[PDB]
Design a binder for this molecule. Sequence first.
Ligand SMILES: *[C@@H]1O[C@H](CO)[C@@H](O)[C@H](O)[C@H]1NC(C)=O
Ligand SMILES: [Ca+2]
Lengths: 120, 110
Amino acid sequence: LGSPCGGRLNSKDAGYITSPGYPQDYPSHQNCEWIVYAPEPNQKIVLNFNPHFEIEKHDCKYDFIEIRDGDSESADLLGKHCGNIAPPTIISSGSMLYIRFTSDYARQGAGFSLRYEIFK
Amino acid sequence: QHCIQHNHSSITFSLLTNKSDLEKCNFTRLQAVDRVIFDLFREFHHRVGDFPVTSDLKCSHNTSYRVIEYEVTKESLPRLQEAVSTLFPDLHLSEDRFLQIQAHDDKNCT
Ligand SMILES: *[C@@H]1O[C@H](CO)[C@@H](O)[C@H](O)[C@H]1NC(C)=O
Ligand SMILES: [Ca+2]
């Protein structure tokens, strides 16, 4: 239970996933991993980001959030977002969603926040 | 055109349109390799004040091609324009461009 950020979350109760310290500036050298899953295999997950969204942009090479369609990091990529504009609504294809936030050494911003729930 | 003159060397400020291939500034590296561009940079940057994290700021880390480059965005523009205005009165930036600071070792401001 040492991990500063991340974890497996059960989506039957809607919750939130945020960069460490949001809305304040996230730390440097971060490497958070989330897995949110639906209780039963038929359901799917839908994410909605908050409009306040500040991640260092450099073609998303340094600070970024990435979303993929499954448990592993090798699942099909749904998006890798940085910059000023929050990403649109994401809807899982299966019943598992992989989320990861990465921070480098230099400059930080407010970060991201999203809310996960079961679709419909 | 918009430039400052020193001793057989000049620092020109220019507005460019195409995205450069430069990488993020590494200030510790940029300090060690060429301190002239770095102290110039920090004189300029303090006038700039708050520069948005979500606007790129890239560096050459080269002595033959010494360039610091800001990205002029919706948010970048006001602070960058207020700063450049202090030095040059004929430089008015605009969105979706890049303001680039190049150092020339022997060409002068003419
Ligand atoms: C920045 O430059 C220094 C050299 O001054 C180097 O040791 C360091 O690894 C660089 N940082 C990154 C993130 O590459
Ligand atoms: Ca960063």
